[PDB]
Homo-oligomer: A and B are copies of this chain.
């Protein structure tokens, strides 16, 4: 039973996901999701699929941006591991309310 030391083949896949460009949010969950959010303002509108793809690209872009900020917060936090306090610190630095 052979078993890797932790997080290193994870970093090999960090090299994999930073060798690429793609989306990762799958389409029917985000479709159902944005129909739930646009449901909450005025109901039952038809859309564009390109609208869904535009919101999905902006979603994953702002995600991986704040994931790299949270990684830099855990580095300055003298840690290998992250916390929600890294995220909360990032919101009060960026001024989010």
Interface residues on A, range: 10 to 19
Q: Which of B77, B85, B88, B94 contacts A92 (CB 8 A)?
A: B94
Q: Which secondary structure dominates chain A's binding surface?
A: helix
**Interchain CA distance A88-B71 in the complex, whole Å:** 11
**Which residues from 42 to 97 on chain A have a C-beta closer than 8 Å to any C-beta of chain B?**
68-69, 71-73, 75-77, 84-85, 88-94
**Interchain CA distance A91-B65 in the complex, whole Å:** 12
Q: Which residues of B contact A85 (CB under 8 A)?
A: 75-76
**Interchain CA distance A72-B78 in the complex, whole Å:** 12
By a beta-carbon cutoff of 8 Å, the part of chain A in contact with chain B is 68-69, 71-73, 75-77, 84-85, 88-94
Pairs of residues from A and B, 7 with the lowest C-beta to C-beta distance, nearest first = A76-B88, A92-B93, A75-B89, A69-B92, A90-B92, A72-B91, A68-B93
